[PDB]
C-alpha cells in the first residue's frame, strides 16, 4: 500500500513518534535554517509538514557552521503531556574531533512555540531521551574518542536526566560497544515485554549502513545482540534501489502493528557500470523510508529479509491524504515564504529577504558569495525528484561584476552551479553560467556571455533536471526560450561525490542575490516554479 | 638609534598616525580577540601598547571566522578633533571570493570607548580614510575581482565619505590599476606639495612583496609611478635578514623629517640550503619595521637603497623609553588579564575564563578542542623572540579522555602542538604530547605517557624555544625538571609552512582547557611565565 | 648581428667545441632518439645540424626510460686529433635517487660512426672531459647525495682518465662545493693565464638558474669564486625575454675573442599577470643562446651586465649562411627521413616506419598508445616558433577503436593532444580529438565526432599555433578547411606546467599510428608540412 521513500529529497535520521492515533517524524536539517522538520501522518503513507521547531537564535545559532555541521540526528518523543525534542549543534565535522552540543527543547503542542534550550552534554552526537516506565528519564548518545590509535565510536553512553533539576545527574556509563561493524551511533531505548531494547546505527551512513538491535533486562546491560543481526541493511543487496538502509526508529501503532523508519540513499541510474566498484551517487541525498516489522522469540524482524523492501503493507487504518501545501508556480502571494523554502544557517530578516518591498515579489538584497558560511541572500528548496523543472523570473540591474542574481543548484558552499545575471565592462548586463567543484570555479560561457538588452524588465531562468544530467535555459519574454549549450551532471551535487566525508545533506534549487560591493543592490523575483516531470 | 623590527612577533600591516608630537601604530589581528593593537611612541624607537579598540561584540563578531580571516590591515588616522579607525572583518579567505566588510569607528581618545561601527562597503580589503585640506574625506580600498579569467586585484577604488550622512556618497571610481607586480592592495593617500601621492603594497605579502608609490595632481589620477619603483622591497636582496618588505605607511614628523613603517618576515637560519629555492620560514609571522625617507625631484626614497636596513637613525627628538608592561612571571593577582594576552575570535566571559573564582589563579572551564573555530577556552600570547622559555603551573583532574589542559604552541586550528594533562583508562591522570599538522594529529609519547601521581596538586609545564627547534619539559615540584623525549621544529608554526596560504598571523603560546564531555571541568593556572633568553 | 636564441625550440645544455675555425654545439636529447645533436657554424650566428652520434643500440639503449631521462647534458671536446663526447643515460628522475651512467665515445670525424661506449663512472650527471696542457686528462661531474637530511648537490668530483687503460684512475676528489645558490652541476674546466677556471651551473634549471665561475692555480683547488658572481643569470631580470640563463660553456675564438653559450627559456606572453608570482610557461623548452665575454683582472664578464642579451655582436669573421635543410612541405620522396624528425627512446625499423612500402609516403605500422615508454610508431619534430602551422595528409582505415592515426602535439607520455582518425561502432571511421594531461584523458568531441565519408581516401589534418593558444582543423579535399571548435592552450605542453619537475624537453609535433589489436594496420602519410607563421 506504501511506496518508499515516504519523504523524498533530503530527509535523513527519521525519528518517529506516536501520540494516540497521530504519527510524527522528525528529520535532521544540518546547516539549513530553521532547524528540524516535522511531518505528521494519520496512515503512515501520506505525510504533511507541520512544524519547524528551531526558529529562534536562542535555540539554534549556526552562523559560520561548517557544511554538514549543525543539526544532526534529532530525537522526537512525547511524555507527561508534552513533546521532547533533542538535538545537536555540531561545530567540527572533520579531523580527530567532532565538537557539537546536545540540547533539549519541549512544547505542549507540535507546532507551538518550543522552549528555549536546556544544555545536556557534549560527549557525542546521536542523542535520544528515554521515558522509563517508573517516570525517570535517560539520555543515550554515542561517546566520541578522538585519539590517534583508536576507533572514534567508543560505544553508547547513558546518564539520568533530572526533569526538576534541568540537568543530567549521576555518572555517565557505557552500556554497549556495538558489534564488529563498529561506527555505533544513533541509539534509541525501548522497554518492550520484559526487556530494554537498544537500537543503534552501525557501519556508517554510506553503503555499509545497518540498523543493529540488542536487549537486556537491565537498563545498564550488558545488552545481547539480535541473533540474526543486522535488523536492517542494504550492504548485501547491490541491486536494490534502496541503498544505505540504517539509522532506524521503531513505532508501535494503535492497531498493535510494528514499523521501522530509516534513511536510505537512492543512487542514480548507473546501468552498464560495475556493480560493486562504486555503488552510486545520490543527489536526492538521504531520504526517509518505512519497513514493516514482525516478532519472533522476543526479537523484531523486518518483513522480507533484513533488506529494505520498496513497497510494504501499511497499518490497519483508513487512508488520509493531504492537500498540496505549495503552489507549483509560487507567485509570492502570501506574507510569508512557503515552508518548503529554507535559508543557509541563519534566519534572513526583512533587511535581506522580504515580500513587503515589492508586492507579489520576493526581494533579495545582495549579500555574500555562494562560498560563504556566514550571510548569503539565498532562499532554496530541496530537489525531491529525479526528473523536474524549476524556473524563476527576475528583475535585476547590476552596476558591477561584484553583483549577481540567479537560479542556483546547490549542494554546499563549495559545490554548486548557477545561471546568473551579472555585469561586464564591455557587454554591460549579462547572463552567464558559473560552477563550483570542490572550490574550483569554472565559467563555461567565458567570452560568449549573453548580452541582456536594456529594455528587458525581466529575465526568466530555468533548469530542467533529467536524472543523470540537467540543463539551463533563459527567456527575455516568458515565451521564447533558449538552451545554454552546456550539459551538467547531477552526480556532482550528490552526497557521494564530496571528498570530505562530511556530506550529509542533498541538492537544493533556489534564488540567490550577491552584492560584493556593499551597495545594497537587490533582485525582485516575481515567482519560483518547481514541477515534477 | 633604532633597530628593526620595532614590534616583534605578530604585528602586520602597520598604520602610523601622528598627532602633534605623539606617535601611534595600529596593526592587524585577524582571528585574535580583541581587535586591533595600537602602540604609542614619542621618538619612533620605543613603543608601548595603548589601545585594543574592537572589544565589543557590536564592533567585532568573529565567531566561526576562518583562520586568517577577521581583522585584516587597519587604518588609523586623526582629524577634526578625533581618531578614525577603519577595519575589515574578512569572512572568506580561500577560493575566488574574499567576502569581507569595511567599517569605521571613532574615538576622542586613543584608549577611549570607540563608537559602534558605521558600515562603509564590502568591495575589497585594505580600506583607508583620507582627510583632504578642503575638509572633505575619502575612502580608498582594493577592489576584488572574483572572475576566473582575471587577476583578482582590480586596482584601487576611491569614493567620498559624507561625515554628515554617515555613508559613502556619489559614485565609486578606480583611480589606479597598479604596476606589473600586481596584487595591488594597502592604499594610502597623501597630499604633498601640489601632489596626491598614492602608496600601495604590491607583489603579495610573501617574498615578492613591495611598496609602490605614485603621484597625481588630480585625486582621481592618472597617477604616474615612481621612476625607480619599488619604493621598498626585499625581493632582490635574498640575504637581507629582513624579508617581505612592503605594506607601508608614511609619517612626516613634527621636526620636518620623513619615515616609513612596513611589515617584514625574519626567516629562521638557512645554511646548507639553496639561497633561492625556498626563501624561509617565519614563526614570528610578519613584524613591524621602520625606514627613513629622503626626497628627490618630488619623490621619496628609502635611505640606504630600496631594501630594508636593519638599523636606522631615529628622528631628532629626545629618547623616551617605557617601563615594562608585563611581568616575566604572571602570578594572576590582577583584576584583569595582562593586555599581551588574547583569545580566539570571541571574548571569554567569567563563565569560561576567570580570575575571580580562585584568587591568584586563572581558571579555564573546558570548552571545545584545539581544532574549533567557535568556542575555545584558550588564553595565549605571541612568540616575540626566536629564543625563549615559557612555563605554566596547573591543577587539573580529568575524569575522561574527552578532557585536557596544557601548554600549547599554536599557529591555527589545524596547526599546533601541546603538552597536556588528560586521562587514560589504565594510567589515570597522564602527561602527553599532541601535535596537529594540517589537521593530522600525532601522539608522539604513546603509549609511554607520564603518569601523574594522585598526590600531585600542580603540574609544572614548560617550553624552551631555540630558534629552529623547541622542547617540552615538566616538573612535579618546580625544581626538578624532566625533558620530554621529542624535538620539535619551529618552522611548522610559521606563515610559510601552511598549505592554504591564508596564513597571516604568527606563533602563539598559551593555556588551554578542553571539556568535550560537557561537565564544565576546569583547570586552574597559578601562573604564566614568558622570558627572553 | 647575432639574435638569440641561436638554437630554437628544445636545445638545452649547449656544449660548444672549437676546432680551428670550425665551431660545434652539442645539446641534450633526453628520451628522443637518436641521442645528441651537434650543430656546426663558421660565424657563431648561422648553425646547421651535422651530427646525431648516438644512433646504435650499443651506444644508447633507452627503451622504458622515464620521461625526461636518457641523454642529459653532453660534453663535446676535441683533442689529440679526435672528437670526445661524454654523455649520461639517466635511468631514475624522481625520488631521492638519480641513477645514471656516464659514457665516453670518440670519432676522428664529427659525423662518422662514433666508437662504442667506454663506461666511466655513475656518481653524477653532467660529465665533462678536460684536456690539460701537459697532455693529461681529467673527468669532472657533479657528486650525488641521496640522503634525507642532505642537499643532493654535493659538489663537483674530479678524477683523471687514462687513455691507454680505457678508464678512470687514482682517487676521486671534491674540488668544489658551490656558492649559497647550491644545486651545483654542469662543471667545465679551462686553463687560462695563471689559473684553472671552473665554470658551473647553479640554482637549478628554472628561474633561479645561474652560471657560476671560480679560479684556482691548482687543478684541485681550492677555488676562489668570481667576485661579482653569478657570471650569468636571468633571476634578477624578471622583465628579460630570456629567462633561466645558465648551464654555460666557454669558447675562445680563432679571432682571440670570447663567448659563452647557455640554455634559456622564453615564457609565453604574460600580460595582466603578476610579474613575480609565476614567471612563465615555456613550450619551446630550453633553447640555446650565446653571449659575449670580456676580461678584467683575470675574470671573464658578460658584456651587457650579468643578464643575457637578446642581440649581441658576433666575432670578426665572414658570414657563412647555410641553405634550409628541410622542405616546408615534406612530400616523402626522399630515401631517408629528414633529420629534424626523431622517435621516442628507440630507433624504428622498416617493420614500423618506412618510406619504402608506399612511394611518396611515410608508412607507420601501428604499435603502442601515446602513454607508452616502450614502442611507439611516432615520428615527430620540435616546435621551434611561437607561431606556426603544421599539417599532414593521411590515408587510414581503422577497423576497431583500438586503432588510431593522427597529428599529435606532444610533451611526454602523460601530456599531449591529438587530432586523430579512429573507428566507432555505429558511425564507422571518425575523426576525433583527444587530450591527456597528467595522464587524465579527455575527448572534447565526445558524441559529435566528424564522420569520414567512406569515399574519401585522404584526411588532411592541421594545427595552427598562435603563441598562448592553438587550434586544430581538417579537410577532405585539401582546399576547404573546418576548424574543430576547441581552443587549446600551449602552456599545457611546457616544461613549467609539468608536475613531476622531471620536465627537461619541449613540445613536438608529429605523426602517429597506434594499433592496439596487433593486426599490423598502418597509416600512409603523404606529406608533413611545418611553416613559421
Ligand atoms: O546525524 C547523522 C549521524 O547519524 C551520522 O554519523 C556519522 C558521521 O561520521 C561518519 O564517520 C559516518 O559516515 C556517519 O555515519 O552523520 C550523518 C547524520 O545523518
Ligand atoms: O591585510 C594584509 C593584506 O593586505 C594581504 O592581502 C593579500 C591577500 O591575498 C594573498 O594571496 C596575498 O598573499 C596577500 O598579499 O594579506 C596579508 C594581510 O596582513
Ligand atoms: O642536464 C641537465 C641537468 O644537469 C639539470 O638537472 C637539475 C636536476 O634537478 C632539478 O631540481 C634542477 O632544477 C636541475 O637543475 O637539468 C636537467 C638537464 O637538462
Ligand atoms: Ca508574483
Ligand atoms: Ca598565582
Ligand atoms: Ca607524398
Identify whether the C-beta of residue C129 lies closer than 8 Å to the C-beta of residue C15.
no
Ligand 1 atom index nearest CA of A201: 4
Question: If you take atom 17 of ligand 3, which residue's CA is the nearest one?
Answer: C504
C-alpha cell of residue B498: 601552511
Same fold, A1-325 and A326-533: no
Q: Residue ranges of the domains in chain C? A: 1-325, 326-533
CATH class of B1-325: mainly beta
C-alpha cell of residue A445: 560561457
Question: If you take atom 11 of ligand 3, which residue's CA is the nearest one?
Answer: C204
Ligand 1 centroid to Cα of residue A112, in Å, is 29
Q: Is B437 on the interface with A (CB under 8 A)?
A: no
Identify whether the C-beta of residue A514 lies closer than 8 Å to the C-beta of residue A366.
yes
Chain B residues in contact with A517 (beta carbon < 8 A)? 121-123, 172
Asked if C274 and B180 come within 8 Å (Cβ–Cβ), the reply is yes
DSSP secondary structure, C174-209, as one string: EEE---TT---EEEEEEEETTEEEEEEEES-SSTT-
Identify whether the C-beta of residue B10 lies closer than 8 Å to the C-beta of residue B286.
yes
Identify whether the C-beta of residue A236 lies closer than 8 Å to the C-beta of residue A249.
no
Nearest to A181 by CA among A127, A250, A232: A232
Chain B residues in contact with A94 (beta carbon < 8 A)? 439
Choose the closest CB to A401 out of B95, B102, B147.
B147
Residue B128: φ, ψ to 5°: -140, 140
A205 lines ligand 1 (CB under 6 A): yes
Ligand 5 centroid to Cα of residue B404, in Å, is 20
B181 lines ligand 2 (CB under 6 A): no
C-alpha cell of residue B399: 575524569
Nearest to C235 by CA among C158, C181, C197, C191: C181
Q: Is A402 on the interface with B (CB under 8 A)?
A: yes
Identify whether the C-beta of residue B275 lies closer than 8 Å to the C-beta of residue B238.
yes
DSSP secondary structure, A202-230, as one string: ES-SSTT-EEEEEEESSTT---EE-TT--
Asked if B276 and C208 come within 8 Å (Cβ–Cβ), the reply is yes
How far apart are alpha carbons B70 and B88 in whole angstroms? Answer: 7
Cβ neighbourhood burial of C143 (10 Å; 0-12, 13-18, 19+) = buried
How far apart are alpha carbons A381 and A512 in whole angstroms? Answer: 12
Integer angstrom CA distances of residue B23 from A43, B301, C424: 76, 22, 78
Choose the closest CB to B180 out of C181, C204, C275.
C275
Long-range CB pairs of A487-491 (<8 Å, 24+ gap) are A488/A409, A488/A417, A488/A435, A490/A268, A490/A281, A490/A283, A490/A465, A491/A268, A491/A281, A491/A283
Nearest to B308 by CA among B268, B262, B275: B262
Identify whether the C-beta of residue B470 lies closer than 8 Å to the C-beta of residue B439.
no
Q: Which ligand is nearest to the CA of C95?
A: 3
Identify whether the C-beta of residue A4 lies closer than 8 Å to the C-beta of residue A47.
no
Integer angstrom CA distances of residue C449 from B18, C423, C430, C432, C446: 70, 10, 6, 5, 6
Find which of B180, B185, B210, B469 to mutate to test the C interface (most C CBs within 10 Å of its CB).
B180
Longest dimension (CA), chain A: 78
Question: Resolution of the deposited coordinates, in angstroms?
Answer: 2.2
Q: CB atoms < 10 A from the CB of B370, how many? A: 27
Our CA angle for B494, B496, B500, nearest 5°, is 105
Our CA angle for A401, A406, A409, nearest 5°, is 125
Residue B16: strand pairing partners: B25
Asked if B181 and C236 come within 8 Å (Cβ–Cβ), the reply is no
Q: CB atoms < 10 A from the CB of C388, how many? A: 18
C209 lines ligand 3 (CB under 6 A): no
Residue B157: φ, ψ to 5°: -100, 145
Asked if B517 and A172 come within 8 Å (Cβ–Cβ), the reply is yes
How far apart are alpha carbons A280 and A497 in whole angstroms? Answer: 9
Q: Is C277 on the interface with B (CB under 8 A)?
A: yes
- Check residue A452 and give left, alpha or beta (phi > 0: left; psi -120 to 50: alpha): beta
Our CA angle for A431, A432, A436, nearest 5°, is 145
Active site residues of C: 13, 185
Q: Is B245 on the interface with C (CB under 8 A)?
A: no
For cell 507541520, what's the residue? A50
Nearest to A488 by CA among A529, A436, A451: A436
Asked if B203 and C273 come within 8 Å (Cβ–Cβ), the reply is no
Assigned architecture for domain A326-533? Sandwich (2.60)
B325 is catalytic: no
Helices (H), C385-522: none
Identify whether the C-beta of residue B286 lies closer than 8 Å to the C-beta of residue B495.
yes
Catalytic entry in B67, B89, B185, B526:
B185
Ligand 5 centroid to Cα of residue B523, in Å, is 13
Nearest to A95 by CA among B368, C427, C102: B368
Solving technique: X-ray
Ligand 5 centroid to Cα of residue B359, in Å, is 8
C125 lines ligand 3 (CB under 6 A): yes
Find which of B31, B67, B90, B96 to mutate to test the A interface (most A CBs within 10 Å of its CB).
B96
SS3 for B491?
A: helix
Asked if B123 and A402 come within 8 Å (Cβ–Cβ), the reply is yes
Residue C198: φ, ψ to 5°: -110, 115
C-alpha cell of residue A189: 531505548
Nearest to B248 by CA among B158, B313, B186: B186
Identify whether the C-beta of residue A63 lies closer than 8 Å to the C-beta of residue A72.
no
Note if the bond before A80 is cis, omega within 30 degrees.
no
Identify whether the C-beta of residue A417 lies closer than 8 Å to the C-beta of residue A408.
yes
DSSP letter, residue A462: E
Identify whether the C-beta of residue A32 lies closer than 8 Å to the C-beta of residue A505.
yes
DSSP secondary structure, C258-318, as one string: EEEEEEEE-PPP-TTS-TTT-----TT-SEEEEEEEEEETTEEEETTSSSPPSEE---SS-
Choose the closest CB to B208 out of C179, C204, C276.
C276
Ligand 2 centroid to Cα of residue B216, in Å, is 26
Residue B337: strand pairing partners: none
Q: Is A148 on the interface with B (CB under 8 A)?
A: yes
Which residues lie closer than 8 Å to B339 by C-beta, 6 or more apart?
B49, B52, B325, B326
How far apart are alpha carbons B75 and B86 in whole angstroms? Answer: 5
Q: Which ligand is nearest to the CA of C276?
A: 2
Amino acid at each position: 500500500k506504501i511506496k518508499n521513500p515516504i519523504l523524498t529529497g533530503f530527509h535523513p535520521d527519521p525519528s518517529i513518534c506516536r501520540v494516540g492515533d497521530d504519527y510524527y517524524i522528525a528529520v535532521s536539517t544540518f546547516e539549513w535554517f530553521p532547524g528540524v522538520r516535522i511531518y505528521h501522518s494519520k496512515d503512515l503513507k501520506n505525510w504533511r509538514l507541520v512544524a519547524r521547531p528551531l526558529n529562534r537564535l536562542s535555540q539554534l545559532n549556526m552562523i559560520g557552521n561548517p557544511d554538514s555541521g549543525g543539526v544532526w540526528a534529532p530525537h522526537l518523543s512525547y511524555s507527561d503531556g508534552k513533546f521532547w525534542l533533542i538535538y545537536t549543534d555540531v561545530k567540527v565535522v572533520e579531523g580527530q574531533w567532532k565538537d557539537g552540543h546536545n540540547y533539549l527543547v519541549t512544547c505542549d503542542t507540535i507546532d507551538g512555540a518550543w522552549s528555549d534550550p536546556i544544555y545536556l552534554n557534549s560527549s557525542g552526537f546521536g542523542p535520544s531521551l528515554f521515558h522509563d516506565e517508573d517516570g525517570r528519564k535517560y539520555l543515550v548518545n554515542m561517546y566520541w574518542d578522538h585519539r590517534v590509535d583508536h576507533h572514534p565510536f567508543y560505544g553508547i553512553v547513558l546518564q539520568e536526566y533530572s526533569v526538576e533539576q534541568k540537568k543530567l545527574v549521576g555518572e555517565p556509563k557505557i552500556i554497549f560497544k556495538g558489534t564488529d561493524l563498529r561506527i555505533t551511533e544513533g541509539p534509541h531505548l525501548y522497554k518492550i515485554n520484559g526487556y530494554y531494547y537498544l537500537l543503534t546505527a552501525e557501519g556508517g551512513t554510506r553503503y555499509n549502513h545497518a540498523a543493529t538491535i540488542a536487549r537486556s533486562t537491565s537498563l545498564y546491560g550488558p545488552y545481547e545482540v539480535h541473533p540474526d543481526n543486522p535488523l536492517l541493511t542494504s550492504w548485501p543487496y547491490p541491486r536494490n534501489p534502496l541503498q544505505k538502509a540504517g539509522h532506524a526508529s521503531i513505532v508501535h501503532t494503535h492497531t498493535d502493528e510494528w514499523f521501522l523508519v530509516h534513511l536510505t540513499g537512492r543512487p542514480l541510474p548507473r546501468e552498464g557500470q560495475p556493480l560493486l566498484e562504486h555503488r552510486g551517487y545520490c543527489p536526492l541525498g538521504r531520504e526517509t523510508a518505512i519497513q514493516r516489522l514482525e516478532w519472533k522469540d522476543g526479537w523484531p524482524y523486518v518483513v522480507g529479509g533484513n533488506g529494505p523492501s520498496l513497497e510494504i503493507d501499511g497499518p490497519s487504518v483508513e487512508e488520509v491524504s493531504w492537500e498540496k501545501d505549495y503552489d507549483e508556480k509560487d507567485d509570492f502571494d502570501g506574507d510569508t515564504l512557503n515552508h518548503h523554502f529554507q535559508t543557509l544557517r541563519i534566519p534572513l530578516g526583512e533587511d535581506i529577504a522580504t515580500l513587503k518591498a515589492r508586492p507579489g515579489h520576493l526581494r533579495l538584497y545582495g549579500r555574500e558569495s555562494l562560498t560563504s558560511r556566514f550571510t548569503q541572500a539565498f532562499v532554496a528548496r530541496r530537489w525531491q525528484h529525479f526528473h523536474f523543472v524549476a524556473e524563476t523570473k527576475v528583475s535585476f540591474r547590476p552596476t558591477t561584476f561584484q553583483q549577481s542574481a540567479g537560479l542556483v543548484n546547490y549542494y554546499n558552499t563549495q559545490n554548486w552551479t548557477t545561471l546568473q545575471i551579472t555585469w561586464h565592462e564591455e557587454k554591460g548586463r549579462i547572463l552567464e553560467l558559473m560552477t563550483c567543484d570542490h572550490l574550483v570555479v569554472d565559467q563555461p560561457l567565458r567570452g560568449r556571455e549573453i548580452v541582456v538588452p536594456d529594455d528587458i524588465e525581466y529575465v526568466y531562468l530555468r533548469v530542467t533536471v533529467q536524472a543523470t544530467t540537467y540543463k539551463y535555459s533563459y527567456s527575455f519574454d516568458g515565451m521564447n526560450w533558449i538552451d545554454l549549450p552546456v550539459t551538467f551532471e547531477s552526480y556532482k551535487l550528490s552526497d557521494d561525490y564530496i571528498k570530505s566525508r562530511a556530506a550529509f545533506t542533498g541538492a537544493f534549487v533556489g534564488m540567490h542575490c550577491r552584492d560584493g560591493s556593499g551597495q545594497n543592490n537587490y533582485a525582485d523575483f516575481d515567482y519560483f516554479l518547481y514541477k515534477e516531470l
